[PDB]
Amino acid sequence: RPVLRSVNSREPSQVIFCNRSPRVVLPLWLNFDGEPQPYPILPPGTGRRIHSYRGHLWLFRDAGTHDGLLVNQTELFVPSLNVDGQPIFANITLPVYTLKERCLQVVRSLVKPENYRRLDIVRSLYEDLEDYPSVRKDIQRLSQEHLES
């Protein structure tokens, strides 16, 4: 029984995914068994209307790198019911990454993993390079945080 899962409300909710980031965004739908399902990509600056449901669970990642993104300033998005004929906005934004994590991202984007160890950096940093951003990992953390609150 996963901690974090969409509830099968069967109650429709109209949503807009609004990509307010310079990243190509991959939306992920955590299904009824808490498994992430990929939806069509969102190019930077675009918006798309989605027919979702109350109590469904979404998260948003960089489509190329799986770097984490925020949605309405948090990690998870849950549609509620529409009132007054208005869609729920899912405003996807960059977090303020650490400078470290940002450097890691740039290096990962330029260097084939096999070549990480040719870089003239301290060994701990090779390790950090290799510890890729992971949806799975984030779901673990978010699951525990959820239980804590």
Binding site: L110, V111, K112, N115, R118, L119
Partner: protein
């Protein structure tokens, strides 16, 4: 509208910030607080153009769109030497090494 700046003179660079509506004079007050030289002993420049104390940073061409936290704009600074003013001189930063092969 906030503007983010580097006030640069020689091998000194001050990171500071102000409003499009702040004046040039107000920047000299910052400089004075940090470098202990009064406004009348300072000249501030955009490119090589002397800025008047009374103009707003906006009027001088600094918009918040351009003077960003992660890419601040540069204000030149020159100090009075004796009775004359030193020429504006801003020294560049160092050069990165050549790009590693595995990054090409």
């Amino acid at each position: 509208m906030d503007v983010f700046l580097m006030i640069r003179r020689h091998k000194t660079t001050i990171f500071t910030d102000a409003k499009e509506s702040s004046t040039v004079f107000e920047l000299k007050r910052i400089v004075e607080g940090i470098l202990k030289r009064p406004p009348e002993e300072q000249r501030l420049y955009k490119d090589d153009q002397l800025l008047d104390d009374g103009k707003t940073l906006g009027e001088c061409g600094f918009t918040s769109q351009t003077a960003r936290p992660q890419a601040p704009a540069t204000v030149g600074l020159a100090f009075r030497a004796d009775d004359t003013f030193e020429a504006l001189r801003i020294e560049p930063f160092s050069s990165p090494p050549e790009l590693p092969d595995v990054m090409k």
